[PDB]
Structures are given as structure tokens and as C-alpha cells.
Design an enzyme around this catalytic site. Sequence first.
Site, PDB file in Angstrom:
ATOM      1  N   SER A  51       7.710 -81.544 -19.727  1.00  0.00           N
ATOM      2  CA  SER A  51       7.840 -80.525 -18.687  1.00  0.00           C
ATOM      3  C   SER A  51       9.185 -79.794 -18.728  1.00  0.00           C
ATOM      4  O   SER A  51       9.255 -78.602 -18.423  1.00  0.00           O
ATOM      5  CB  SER A  51       7.637 -81.156 -17.309  1.00  0.00           C
ATOM      6  OG  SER A  51       8.472 -82.289 -17.148  1.00  0.00           O
ATOM      7  N   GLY A  52      10.243 -80.505 -19.110  1.00  0.00           N
ATOM      8  CA  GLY A  52      11.586 -79.930 -19.152  1.00  0.00           C
ATOM      9  C   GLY A  52      11.887 -79.106 -20.389  1.00  0.00           C
ATOM     10  O   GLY A  52      12.904 -78.415 -20.438  1.00  0.00           O
ATOM     11  N   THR A  55       9.710 -84.573 -18.046  1.00  0.00           N
ATOM     12  CA  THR A  55      10.173 -85.246 -19.214  1.00  0.00           C
ATOM     13  C   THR A  55      10.729 -84.238 -20.165  1.00  0.00           C
ATOM     14  O   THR A  55      10.191 -83.197 -20.354  1.00  0.00           O
ATOM     15  CB  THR A  55       8.987 -85.965 -19.831  1.00  0.00           C
ATOM     16  OG1 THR A  55       8.689 -87.132 -19.095  1.00  0.00           O
ATOM     17  CG2 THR A  55       9.227 -86.395 -21.261  1.00  0.00           C
ATOM     18  N   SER A  56      11.846 -84.582 -20.766  1.00  0.00           N
ATOM     19  CA  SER A  56      12.513 -83.765 -21.789  1.00  0.00           C
ATOM     20  C   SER A  56      12.663 -84.592 -23.064  1.00  0.00           C
ATOM     21  O   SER A  56      13.475 -85.516 -23.117  1.00  0.00           O
ATOM     22  CB  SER A  56      13.884 -83.319 -21.285  1.00  0.00           C
ATOM     23  OG  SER A  56      13.751 -82.600 -20.070  1.00  0.00           O
ATOM     24  N   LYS A  95      11.787 -93.804 -23.723  1.00  0.00           N
ATOM     25  CA  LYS A  95      10.678 -92.973 -24.195  1.00  0.00           C
ATOM     26  C   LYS A  95      10.647 -92.826 -25.712  1.00  0.00           C
ATOM     27  O   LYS A  95       9.715 -92.238 -26.261  1.00  0.00           O
ATOM     28  CB  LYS A  95      10.758 -91.592 -23.549  1.00  0.00           C
ATOM     29  CG  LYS A  95      10.644 -91.636 -22.037  1.00  0.00           C
ATOM     30  CD  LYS A  95      10.904 -90.280 -21.419  1.00  0.00           C
ATOM     31  CE  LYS A  95      10.886 -90.371 -19.906  1.00  0.00           C
ATOM     32  NZ  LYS A  95      10.780 -89.030 -19.275  1.00  0.00           N
TER      33      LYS A  95
END
Lengths: 241, 117, 250, 226, 231, 196, 244, 204, 243
Positions: free
Chosen positions: F129-130, F1-2, F33
Amino acid sequence: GYDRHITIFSPEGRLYQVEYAFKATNQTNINSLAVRGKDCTVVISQKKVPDKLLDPTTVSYIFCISRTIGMVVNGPIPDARNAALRAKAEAAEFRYKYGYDMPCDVLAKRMANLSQIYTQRAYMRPLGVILTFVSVDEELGPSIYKTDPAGYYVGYKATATGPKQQEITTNLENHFKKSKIDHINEESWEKVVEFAITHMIDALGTEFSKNDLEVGVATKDKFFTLSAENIEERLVAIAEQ
Amino acid sequence: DRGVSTFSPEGRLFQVEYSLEAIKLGSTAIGIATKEGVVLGVEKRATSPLLESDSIEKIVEIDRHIGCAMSGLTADARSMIEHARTAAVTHNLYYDEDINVESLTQSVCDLALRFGE
Amino acid sequence: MTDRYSFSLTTFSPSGKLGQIDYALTAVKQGVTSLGIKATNGVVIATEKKSSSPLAMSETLSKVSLLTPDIGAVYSGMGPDYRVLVDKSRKVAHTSYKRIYGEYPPTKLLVSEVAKIMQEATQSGGVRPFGVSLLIAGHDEFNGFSLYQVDPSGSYFPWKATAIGKGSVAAKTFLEKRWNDELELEDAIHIALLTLKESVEGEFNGDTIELAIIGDENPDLLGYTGIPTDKGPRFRKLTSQEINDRLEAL
Amino acid sequence: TTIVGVKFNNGVVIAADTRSTQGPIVADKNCAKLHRISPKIWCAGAGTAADTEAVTQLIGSNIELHSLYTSREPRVVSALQMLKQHLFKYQGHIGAYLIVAGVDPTGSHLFSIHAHGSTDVGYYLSLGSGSLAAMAVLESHWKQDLTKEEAIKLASDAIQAGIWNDLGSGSNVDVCVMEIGKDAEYLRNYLTPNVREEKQKSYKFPRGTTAVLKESIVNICDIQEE
Amino acid sequence: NNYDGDTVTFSPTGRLFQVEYALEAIKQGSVTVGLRSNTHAVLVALKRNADELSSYQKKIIKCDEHMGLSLAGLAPDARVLSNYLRQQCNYSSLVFNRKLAVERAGHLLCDKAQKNTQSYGGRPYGVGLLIIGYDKSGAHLLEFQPSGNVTELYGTAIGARSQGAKTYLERTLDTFIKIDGNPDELIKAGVEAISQSLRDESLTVDNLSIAIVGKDTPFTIYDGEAVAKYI
Amino acid sequence: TSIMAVTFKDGVILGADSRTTTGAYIANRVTDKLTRVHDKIWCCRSGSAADTQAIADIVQYHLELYTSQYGTPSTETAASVFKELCYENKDNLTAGIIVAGYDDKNKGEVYTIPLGGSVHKLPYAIAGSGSTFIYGYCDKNFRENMSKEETVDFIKHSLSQAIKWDGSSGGVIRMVVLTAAGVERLIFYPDEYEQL
Amino acid sequence: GSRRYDSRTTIFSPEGRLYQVEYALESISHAGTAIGIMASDGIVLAAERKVTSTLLEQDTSTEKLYKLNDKIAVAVAGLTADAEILINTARIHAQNYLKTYNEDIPVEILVRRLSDIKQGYTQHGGLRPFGVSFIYAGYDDRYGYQLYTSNPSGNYTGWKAISVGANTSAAQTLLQMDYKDDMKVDDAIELALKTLSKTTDSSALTYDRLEFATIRKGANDGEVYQKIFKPQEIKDILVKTGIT
Amino acid sequence: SDPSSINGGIVVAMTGKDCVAIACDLRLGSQSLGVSNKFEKIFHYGHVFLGITGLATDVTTLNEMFRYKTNLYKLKEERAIEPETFTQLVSSSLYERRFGPYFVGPVVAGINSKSGKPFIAGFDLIGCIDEAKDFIVSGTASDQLFGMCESLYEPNLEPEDLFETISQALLNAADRDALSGWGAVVYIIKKDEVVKRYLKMRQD
Amino acid sequence: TGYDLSNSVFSPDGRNFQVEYAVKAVENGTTSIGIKCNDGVVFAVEKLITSKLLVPQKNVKIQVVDRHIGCVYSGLIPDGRHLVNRGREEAASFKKLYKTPIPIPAFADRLGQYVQAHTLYNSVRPFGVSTIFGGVDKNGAHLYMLEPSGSYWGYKGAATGKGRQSAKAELEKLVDHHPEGLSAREAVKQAAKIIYLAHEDNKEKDFELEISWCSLSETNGLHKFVKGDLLQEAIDFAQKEIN
Ligand SMILES: [Cl-]
Ligand SMILES: [Cl-]
Ligand SMILES: [Mg+2]
């Protein structure tokens, strides 16, 4: 004679504590009125600030329960605020649990059921208030639902509450006998508020300044109260015709 | 009616003052303290000659170094004695010693006003 | 705080009367008249919509309520008490039966559960009895059509036909003359409208009368198709127009 | 298990296979994975069989009582919310993976729910062991502005992809169409592409083949009069 | 009259009779005096006996090394309240390594007594307390009433005939406040103050009870031949 | 996810990808999101979808009840309610949330709430995570008091790189603009942002 | 506080009587008469429905006679709603015993349990007692056919023949006169109906005003059958005995 | 260790023309040790039959539980419970123990007394209903039973034919399972008569 | 009759006589006032010197809630302390959850609901205090007064106790003569005067003056007690006006 102190039946099949709670309703000596337009629901109420030491902005018997629902109360302010806080909590919980905004009639029923419990359970006293809920429901449209200390509730075309409710009620009854419709045939809410104020003036026989009234308006997706200057603009339009 | 823990206009607890009247109806008990020992004596007062008087237990042991005599509604004393005996033995368990007579008495008297509604 | 009323507020008097139950029945007597008639192929329940104000929308207030798809209820006495009883009745039909057996309860057993709730308000601590009498009409596969009355005491009796509330004494006499074991549903509705007209003072039309039936299955009211065994609710509330049509042939 | 949901012009359609497994064994060849929450709100379930049934019945029961309380037809977001809050509370231990769909006064809706309580919105969805085979079909053939007939075809094609290619899925195709302003049509066994061929032989035995030791009449009736 | 059945009931003039009846129990109790200077604070208590064979009921209770009180009224209620103070003094020490302020000790007693006056079922405390102590702001004297009212004072007296001692202290105010660094003279003033409340009986060796706390003086109680010096 | 939130001159902009994964399978390629807890208070969600949804649903309920009693809440107040949930239930949750909102008094504000339940007020924030792959890029390219168009380009370029390198990130780039003017939703498709 | 409104349901009078129990018994004395008669080969239960109507659905009605299990039944006198609370508790107790010991509950044990529940309401809890009196008719392999009665006090006793409800004084005298130990069920049926026919406050005793039941070993071989009589069957037995 | 395979056992049910059949083995063991050869696993509550496989203590417990519940049902409803209704009651009762389940494999069999329609159903240990038209299997040799039933079974068999089919299905399945056998019982059920037959089988 | 013996019982009027009897306890108490000024609020109270033995400036009556709210009350002092203890719990939980210090209108309802709850049951007694309270928040200055019934409103000036009528008259003059507003330092001086003027109703015993204030400019929006030179300056101003 302890059947008059707690909520148990008298020999006549009556609940005296409930009847006396109805009498507390008029302790404030304030009259309220509610009417429906095409796209809106308007509620007006008398405002009385007897003391000069009071901050008049904090003196109010109209409450914003949710974004869509408004509530005017007839009765003492402590019980009024008690009911208001509960209705706000119930409306918020409903949205969380069921994923949509609590309808006006459903909230009225819920508060009426709570009031019913006080008429049956001995340790809880009835609240000395009559709650008038208003909104523009997404299914039923403009809506007025009123609750009392007995736990009774019903929908209304229009309604009035207070010491001089009967004078206002008959005034409204006579208007709807002429028009032969269940609402005020008017486009803008501004003119519906003007109707509400005009017919209260006619019924009560008193003139109003900007600080003598308190107004709440329900439209689609929001309920809001008018300021003194918004009411003044309304009073000017009435006088000019 | 009226509260059980109610004060009278004179500043006394009604129920406590009434319990004192019940004690006045009870059989006599006498105690005398000396430098050589303490003596405790009681009136048994059997209600009938067929009642075996030796079963009347109005003098009672709390511990080896503490005794007790009673007067009034003697049935009420059983739970007080049980508490006293437990308190005496419990203190010996916690502190490896005999318990002071005053401290034992104080423990019994703590029960007294634990009444209400 | 705490509810410190853990004792009964309904007690026996020297004469053996339970005062609060008697007084609750007096409250029922003051209430508006409602009635129920049982036919061979259905049951009808009816009452007057006594509107408190002409500004009030009487359609929003439902005196006749669906409890299950095949069971309905009507009352006389205190409306708020009735409203909460219907809420509890609908819930107990699920919790104490449908969630166990996978089907709706038969009329008599649902009545039994409602009766139990009303009995408990007559004996439990810190509460008064319910100030209502209920008439519960319903159908189930093995018992067929049935009509029950439930009183504030919790007592319940099955009826061929009956009336409760204001003019019940006169209405029950009227029903005794007209009722027979060969009545069709339409005949029972006709008799219900005749009986109810006697106790009503003012306007008598579809807008001032509330009437519902337990009759044939209504597949049009089911809401879905594709399951042969599900044929729809037997409970149906008659419309304002449907009532007025039968008032012309009155 | 393969379950799908597809939105179209004036409503939504859901579909499912009919296989139930116990490891490598087939427990039920004609299982019903399409559940009715309310008349116009149906959900398709994958995962633990008893859980999808129980969680659907419970929320359907509470939705019915809610509909009676509010005097309104139930909404899909209500069923969605009640389901996810229930499943979240049990931290995924109630293994129900659902596709919830329906029509209500607000319109037509399509959602998915996972056992841990996460919800997702979409025009086309698929869950279960055959969800990848089904989603491959949906991603290849789905388009905006589908007709009812096109949506049923896409949905059943997606289930077939699971039936043929996934060992956890099989047998028949169930469908439920929920169109706006109409009754919901539940099409049980919409497709039956897996009928067993005639057997080569009859294994009906000669009467008396089995060896018996005792016989007796069983009393199933109540205690008798007289 | 009709409004004295329980503590939860106001009278038509806004009075709480059960609280007033509890206040009456204090007036029946034996006299006790409290007074302080800038360095020390003193309690003087007239103990009462049942008869000649009996002991003289103890009037003074220690709460901490720097704090304690004298009682007048129901002795068991004083035991409950003094036990509460002991715990609060102790909580302050264990958790915050801090000796409990006398003013804050009064606030805690007030709030504990109050709960008993507003709730159904219970009853007010039937005892009055005089709390003395030495903390970071010097010597202190408090007067506790079971209505909840707590008051900080230079000197005071509660119990039967306490008005005589209270008048004496009101005259002597300017003198005894200045008695700094002299414990014996401060006690003398307290013994002379309590003497104004005596009738018929006089201060004997097993009758008198004195307590003191100060700058370099832990709360200590004097009884028996230890108070013969002051008779 | 960014995910990221960036304050600028006129207010604040939230940005996110649209990928939801179950291992290497993309369960949803068009996820939203960026979620609303109040009219002009939104959040970016990362971590467990179930946990972050349950949290955001509760927060929305708290702020709805706050508004009914005390009027419009501050962005700081919203961050505190998130924090109280994330901190007190840290053992059972996996949620990395960025809170962003617009006041007229305080203007644009951004609070990040990582795993522990700690709160950090920042000019801009990145998470998921990104985010690891763009710490260098975002630090070098961020400026205070940027324009709306500059800030959109900053988020677009940053998330583009995060998507490029992180397998758990992808799909479309969603953005939400919070100003006095109102609430604007933006969307940017692969063909647009991949060629940057 | 709340003390002001407490009736104090569980106290003694100066004479040593329980007020509420005595008043509950007064209530029960106005209820429809119920009779139980025990014979050597069975037990009879007869009971009078209270002033009925022609529009009452009788064949589906039950206000007097209830089934506790296959071996035990009860006749009710008092508040029907109160009785159903206790009946459901008794039904559960019987099933608990059957689950625990894998045997049908002995009649006395069931009676004692219900009687203990009634007792509790007279000693603690501050609630009103149950305004109900039961006649228990049952069978087990220890004592055979048994008749018991319990009342709101929680006191229970065993009987050969007994009546509860209205006119028990008159009814008990008539039973005491015509009852004999070697009596049979058919004779006991006749006695029960004849007693009701004389003690009734109604003008005439008819089928629609009665509930009737028998517990017979008149079941095929060593076993017991409960028969709750139907309206038509009550009508036939009224003609047979010569009352109508 | 595995609760469902400590005691061992099997149950099978089949439908026929206006009839149903339900059968079980008689073994009860402690793993390898055979203890009892009279442990029947089929019970009946009125005209509804219930077979239960699995952990024997739970088999006994559940029988006593459903006897309890059906006896109360009958007292309140004034009628015997039907197979369709009883099936729902079993599912309800098992799912209430969702996270502490009874280790059992129930099988319901019976004929609806009103419609006359034959009915069978199977469950997992936590409530899931399998309402089959043809047959239901349960136990340690359920794989064996599936293979026998799926090959031997044909629809609309007469009672005396159905007896042979179900008996051969059970017998040959049990002989390929170490924890099943030691005797067998077959119930043949018609709308108003029920025959119970003990089968002669190999005692190893 | 008997309707006045139990709390939460409606009389045939629709009145709760027990609450009305609690008001009598309030009317019996010492005078306390509140003045809303330009950017804050000022609180003042009359402390009766029962005896010379009372230590001056030690028996403090005015209480702080959080760090920005002041509370003063007339009537049963312990009841007021109980109410403030609750107020402190309410303010703590608000700041715990929502971070920001509790707004004054929000705080007013917390007390209001709590006091109102003590009129709902017969198992509790109503509060025997009228509480004047307020302070500075994000939206500015607020002054409130709360009665035994749970009733409260916002005020420009507020007064309660035995000398409330005298005080109210004085407050009304300030509202009329200062429509543009009153400064914080002026309000302290006026507060002193009003207490001295209101002391004519308790003229038997002499008294001690106690003042506190919250002001955005003078105290940075925090509650502080008026001490030393500023207190003496206000006493001198008050003594000059009565003579
Ligand atoms: Cl409700
Ligand atoms: Cl998500
Ligand atoms: Mg072997």
C-alpha cells in the site's frame, strides 16, 4: 509352494521373499562402513567402475537425503534410488508439517515401517537394499541408524555392510574393546575419515586409490560427499605415517 | 488357473470357443428370408410333459419391425433382448424413425466381448 | 498397478486349521522370551534385549513400549510387526477413545482394539497375520491392575502371570510355583528376574534386560504441576542401575 | 477475553482472565482459558470457546503421538505449525485466536496465532477484546532481561487491565509459568480480585412453599435379580 | 508353454506368447492388399463368407474423408480400433481444424495396442490393419500389428497366403509407384497383386472389395457391381 | 505495507517495514516481512499475512525438495513456484509478493508477483500500500549497477517516505543483502530514518 | 498376475458343498462345548472354557458368553476374535433398531441379520468365512423365550435345547433323552451341567472351567433379567446340583 | 426463523449437600401456538441425567443418540457411564457437527457413583463445556433463570430445601417468558434415590 | 522353482528373473548407440530393411523429448514409445512448475523410477527396452543408458542391441585415443562408422542409417536429426572405413 513367491508365512514361520531380498543386497559386491567421531559421522563405501565407457562421476551409492542426513545403500541401484527418492520426500514433508529438520533415527524408523508393510502386504515386494542413515543430530549427536528388508532398524556405535561385513565388523569390535568408548576420540573429521579408510584396508586386506573409494561426511548442520582429490589428500596422509 | 480373455496358440479366445460348444447343445432355431418376409421358427423342447409349453419363450419381439429367436443358454439372452429393445426405442426417440436391422444387430454384438477380470 | 489381492491369504484347510495363524504362532515360538507378572499393588513386564551386534546400540531399540500413561506392552516374535502395532495401538487409543471420552481407555478395551487390528490381518484381502504375541500390562480406576496376552489370531486372555516365546513352557511352570495373591510389586519384580535368568544364555544385567512396571502414580514424571487430579503416569521403565541393584539381592 | 504472553530470563509465562460471554450475558465466571498441549507447551485461547478447546485438544493429541513416535520431547514450533495449517485450511471459520508458549530442547518460545492462520513472534503479546488494554500496560512496563517474578507481575497486571477496562473480560487471573529445566507450574486462580460480597438476606424458603401435583420414585438401577 | 498364460509374462528367451498368439489370428484371416503411388493410395480386400447363404464379411472401414483401413483377424477388435481412429481424426478436426496426419494416426494406434500388452487382466488385439490416407505430405500406406509395431510402406499384404501378393509388389515396386493421375491402373495393379494369393477360388462380384483415396478423391469403398469393371 | 527489492552491482537487497495492521490497530510493530525460501532466495510479503505465510511455507518446501533432487534452484524457478500458487488460487488469495535471489551465474535478480499471479522480471520492484507514494521518487532516483552503500541509502530513503505517508506502514526498516559474500541482515530504527 | 495365489473361498465342490464353510465347521467341532436349554420360565446358557491354567484371571475373563443387549445374549463356539467382530455388529444393529422404532429388537430379526452377514462371506468378496457358531438366548414380547443357532454357512434354526462346538452328537443325544416341555429353569440348569459333565474331555468338571448364564423372568414383576454367573456362584451351583 | 426459539423451553440444574437437582418446563409450541403440555426435556441414562432445550426435533434426536451411545458404552465397559465422562461424550458428539449443528442447549446432572461428588454441566450448541459448582441454566428464559439462580441460590442446601429454591427459580423465570411454562418437573437426585415432582403452575 | 513365472518375485539368488528375461528381448533388437562429445551428444541406430517395400527415411526410430533431449532404444519398439510418452509428460510437468527445461540427470531419474516401478508388482510387465538418451542442459552435456531393471548410469559412450559388444569395443577405442575429447562433427562420423561395423551381427539383411545430435555450438543445444549432405558425408566416411 507359493509361500515362497509372496510374503506369507511358511510352515517354519519364515518369510522367504524377505530372506531372498537380503541376498539381493550383496548383488553389487560392494562393502560399506560407518563410524562416529566427536563432532562428526563418517561413512565410506567401495567404488567399482568396471566399464571404461561409464562416466565415473555418475556412479554412486551415497545419497544426500537432506541437508543434515546422508544415506549409503547396499543393494541394486534401481531399488537404491527408489528408497532415496522416498526418503528425500519424507524428510521434506516432515520439515513442512512439524517445523524442524527430520532426525536421522526418525527417518530410519519411517523407512523401516515402509519396509515392514512390504513384508506384510502381498502386492508390494520388499526392496533388496540395506539403508544406512548418518547425521549429526542436534539432540543425540553423531548418529548411525541402519534399515533392512525385514523392517528391522537400530542405532549403531559403528557399522559395516556388504559381502565382507563380518571381517570389518570384528575389526571395529576389537578397536572399541581397547578404547572402551562409543566413538572415535578425534577432533577433526579429516582424521576420522582416515581412521575409517585405514581400518577398512586392514579388514579387507586391499589397498585403495582415489577412484576406488567413495566418502560421505556428516557434520553439524550439513552432510557432504568428498571428491576424488579430497580422498587423495586423505590417502596421502595415511601413507605418510 | 488362467485368464478369461486368454488367446489359444491357434489365435482364438478360449472362452468364446467354449461358449460356442454350449450353443451346440441348445434347441434348434431356424430362419428363412424372402422378398415377401422373414420367417423364424424354434424347437421348444420341454424337459417334462407337466411343463406348460406355451410359457417357453424362445422367440421374442425387439420392435414392431424386428424379431429375434435364440438357441443355447437362453437365460443369458434376457439382458441381450433388454439391450436390443432399449437400443431400438432409444434410436426412435433420438431420430424419429425405425432403426436399421444391421445397426440393431451391431449394437447387440458390441456387448459380446465386454467380458474380463 | 492397483492392489489386485482383494482375496484372503488365510483360509481354512480340510482339517479346520487356519495355516497362516499356526505358522505365525510358530514364528512367535522362535522369538525371544518375554513375561508378565501381576502383583496386588502393581504389574511387571520383562524381556531380554537380544542385541544383533555389539556395535549396535541396544538402548535405541525399545522392546517394552508405553501405549498410554497407565498401559505398557512387550512382545515375542517379529520386531518390525510389533513396532507398527504399537504405532497403531497408540493412535487407536486416541481416535477411538480419548478424543471421544476425554480420558485414556481402560486396559481391556485398548487390548480389544489391538486384538481387532490383528484379527483383520487374519481375514482381510492381500495380507498375512501379524507374527507377534503381545503382553499388555495396565491399570485403570474401575478395573484396577490387569495383564493381557494377545495372539496372532486376535484372541486375548487375562493372566495373573505368564510367559511367551522361546522358553515359555518352562517359564510358566516356574511362575506357577512362585505366584500367589498376596505378592507386593517388589516381590513380583524379584520373581520376574529369577524367571528370566533361566531363558537367558549370555550376559544377565541391566544393559541386556528390559523391564518396566505398572505401579504407583509418578508425579515427578508428569512434567507439570497445578492440577490435583493429574497425579502422573503409572507406567515406568526401570533404569539399567535400578535393575542391577535388585540383581545383588537376587 | 484478555490473554497475554511474556518472555523472561529463563523461560516464558502466559496468563488469562476467566470470563465467558454470550452477548451481554456472562456464561461462565470461572472459565479456564489456559490449555495444555503437552506437559511444557501451553496455549491461551480467545474467540470461539468450543473452537479453542477442540483445536488445542486435537493438536495436543497429535503432538503426544508425535512425541511417542520420535522418542523426543515435543517442540513449540511443531504445535505452532500444526495449528496454523489446521486453521488456515478452515479459512478462519474456526474462530481460535491463540498465544502458544513453552520450553523444549531448543529453548523457550512465544508465538501468537490468528484464526486465519497467521503467526507472529515476540517477547510480549496479547490477544482478545482486552488486548488493547493489556498491550497498553505491556508497552509501558515491559523491558529486556525480566526476571520470573517481574514477568508474572507484568503478565497479571496486563490481564487486570483487561478485567477492569474491558467488558468482555473479567473475574479471575490464571497463570502458567514455563521455565527452562523445570516442571511447568499452572497457577489456576493466581488472583481473585472479584469475590462477590455477602448478600443482605437469605432467600432460603420455608419447606412446603412450592405447590406440587405428583411425586414418584425414579428407577435408576438396573433390572434386579429374583 | 508355462509363459503363455497371460500377456504380463516374458518367456526365458524374451518372448511374449500371448502377443504371438494374437499375431497368429491375423494369419488365419482373409487376405488383404495395400499399395500406393504419389497421387493415390489403394486398398484391395478379399472378403470371406460363412457359406453360400451367408453374406461376405466386410473388410474395409472408413475413418475420415481422407483416411481408412482394411482388416484381417478379429473383426470386433478392428471395430474398436477403427472407432478410436475415427475419434482421433475427429478430435484433430474439431479442436485444431486440422486433418490428422497418417503417420500420427499410426503412432496413436501403436500406443493403444501397447497398453494391452504390458498390463494384467487385459489381452492383446487380435487383428492386423492396413491404413491408407492422403494428407499434407501426399499418399501414405501403413501396416499395423497388434504387438504395437506400425510400419510405413509403398505396398504390402496381410492375412492368409499374403506372401504371394507381397512378392509381386516387391517386383512391381518401380512400376506402380509411377502410376500418377490414373486411379483405374493403380487398382488394376492391386487386383493383380491380390490375385497372386488366390487358390481354388477366384475374384467374383460379391467377393472383391476395393477402396481408394487420393489428391482429389475422398476415401470411397467399392463393392458389388462397382468392382465388376476390375474383374 | 512498504516493500521493495533492488538489484545492484554485487547482488540484490530486499527491504521492508515492520507494521502489521488490523484496521487501524497495529497488531505487530516489529514484523519480519522478509522471509527465506532458500539460502540465497528470499521474498518480500504484502497482503494477507496468513496467505503469504502459507504460500512461503509451501514454496520453501518445494525448493527444499528441489534441492534434494536437482541441486540449487534458480531465482526464476522460485518465482515460478510462487506464481503457480498465486495464479491457480487467485480467487482465494490476497498476496503481493516480490521474489529476490542471488546466483553466481545470473547474479542479482528480482521478480514481482502482484495480485493476478502474473510475473514480472525487473531491475527493481516496489509493492504494498505504501509503494504508491514512492513511484515518483524511486523512478527518479534508481540507477543500475549501484554500490551496496548507495542501494542501502536508496531503499532507506524510499521506505522512509512510504512509511511517512502510509498509515499501514511503519516501525523499523528491515533489509536483507544477498551477495556472493553471504547473507547480511540490516535494521534501521525510526530515530535514524525519520530525520532523512 | 494375482490370480495364481487365489484360494477361491466362495465356490462349490462337485458335490455341491461350500469347501470353506465345511472346513470352518470342522474348526468349530474342536471348540469348547456350549449348551443352550429353553424352559417355560427362562433360558439357560452353559459353556466350557478350553484347557485353562491356574494363572488365568477368571473373574475378569470372558471367552464364551457375551451380552448383545439387556434381553439377548450369545454363547460362542469357534474363533473368539471372529466372534467379537460379529458381536459388536450385532450390538450396533440392536441399537439401530431401538433408535428407529423405539422398541427392543425382536430376537429373530437380530439373528437373521447376523446370519445374513455370514452368508455374504460364502457367496461374494473372496474372503474366508467367520469360523464361529452362535447360540442365541433371548426374549421378546412376541414369541417369549427363544433359542437359536447360526453357523458359518449363515443358516439359522430355532431350538428347545441345543449344543454347539465339541461332542455335539453325544450332547444332543443326552439332551434329547432328559428334556421335557414342562421343564423349569432350575431343572434346566441341572440338565445343562450334567450334560457338560458327561461330554467333557477333561477329567472333572470344575468352576474354573465353566461360564454360565441365565435369562429369567425371575425379575421383580413383568420384566427380564440377565445373570452372568460369577466364579463363586458357579462353584455354588456345582455343589447344589451335586457334581462336586 | 430462529431455530432455538420456535418450540421454546427451559432447563435448570443446581447442586446441594450430597445431592443435585434438575428441572424443566413442559411446553412444546409452534411459535405462538401451544401444542403439547407433556413434552418433558429431561432424560436419564443410568444415574446420569440430561436436560435438553432448543429445537424439539433435535432434542428428541439427541436423546435417542445418547441412549444409543450409552447402551454400547455399558456393554463394552461393563459399567454405567459417569457424569464427568458423559459430559465429554456430549461435547464430542456436538462438535462433530460443528458446521451443521444441533440447535440445542444441553444440561448434565448427576452424582459420581464412586466419589459421591455432585456434578452439573452446561453446553452451547457446538460443544463448549461450562462445569459450574453452583448452577446451570438453559433455554428461552435463560436470562430470567440467571437472575433467579444468582439471587436465590446458596451453597450446601439440603435436598428438601434445594427443591424449593430450584422450583421457585424455574417457576418465576418461566412466568416472564411467553414460550416457556405449561407445567414443570423437578428431579431431586441423591446417591441412591431419585424423586420426581410435577409442579403446579399457571397454564398461560 | 516357479520364481520366474511372476514379476517382482525374488528367486533364492535374490534375482528377478522376469527382468532378466526382458533383457533377452533387448539383446534380440537392432543396434543403437550414443556418443558423448565436447559440447553435446550424438545418437545413432541401425534400421533393418526387411523389404524393398519399406519407404526410405520414413520409419523414424529416434525420438525427441522436450526440445533438448534425444531418446533411442533397442528391443520392443512399442515399449520404448510408451517410455518416451511418459518422459514427455515428466518433462512437461517439470517445466510447468519450475519454468526451466528439465535437466538431463533429473530426467534420467524420472525414467529410472518409472521403469523401476514396473519391477515392483506382478500386475505389470517389465520394459523390454534398453534406452540410450541425453542432451545439453545448464551444466553441459550428459549421456545416459537405462536398463529394464530401472538401472541407469552416466556414460562417455553407450551401446545396446544385438551388436553391442562390437560397438562397445569401438567406443572404448575412442575414449582411449581421445582423452582431451571428441568434437560434435567427429562424433557424427564415428557414430556412422560404429553402426556400420556393428552391422556385421545383422549382416543378412541390408540396413538404413539414422543419426541425430544435440550440440551447444552446432545445434544451439537443441535436438536435431542429421539430414542430407551431412548424413551422406557420414555414410561415405563409414563406407570408406569398412573397405
Ligand atoms: Cl510410519
Ligand atoms: Cl507476518
Ligand atoms: Mg399464553
